[PDB]
Amino acid sequence: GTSDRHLTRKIITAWLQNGILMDQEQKILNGDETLFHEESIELFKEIPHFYQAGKGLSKSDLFNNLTLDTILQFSASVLWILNWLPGLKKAINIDEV
């Protein structure tokens, strides 16, 4: 829904490379236990350096988290794509069959 208009979707703000890019490297195996506090603290605290915590914040806890409805939505569709990718990514049957 971005189209920001009118929302600081800080999740979507946290969809920013290289934190998203190394987050895909942290989605690779996922990360295979190189769960870099460099990466996690850097990107996940980088936009969240805005207060930072802190102190005395200007920050989250109902400031624009996803609702439970949108959570059950996103969980639903991710269950769908998981059920999709085996069943529909199987049949590639090399290479035009």
Partner: protein
Amino acid sequence: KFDETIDGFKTLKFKLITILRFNIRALCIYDIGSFFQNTKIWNMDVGSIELDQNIASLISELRRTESKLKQQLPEKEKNSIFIGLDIVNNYALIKGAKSIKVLNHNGIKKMLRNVNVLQHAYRNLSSEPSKINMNVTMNFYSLCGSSEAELFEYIKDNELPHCSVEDLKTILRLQFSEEMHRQLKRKEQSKEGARTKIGKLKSKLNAVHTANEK
């Protein structure tokens, strides 16, 4: 069909990425129960029992969130997103969480006990793996509650992967100091042990792991 299934893979990493960001930002959201925790006390507030209700909420919706997430989806992704994002954001959550206020020797045991409870919580998600943010942040915020500058030299010469050591060492400095800086009142204080932490700011702090500057 490789562009196709490639794109479906890209939606998979985008979606599971979004779920991991959702749980992790639910945590970093939830740490703002400390902001404000209504004046985390100076040198004591004894007693000093328990338990910063917002953190119990964090344990609660964390627990139910893992309940339903274990209900719908498959196991391995849940262990992945929850494992990495939970433990890492727990650790750095304590790290930036150190920048708070004047500090309490009883409230050291309070926020210590709360931090041990959240260690029991993310442990209750998964503990057989390296649930070391328990050990790291417990000995690190306990090390903040430690006020011995000799321990400040001794610890971090042996332990504490504490990459915020500028603010971490300045914060345990601000914790022995946060006991000092309202040990009296007017003054509160003379900064003579903080003359020993100006010198120890040069010595117990700016002997910082051969980058001797903190």
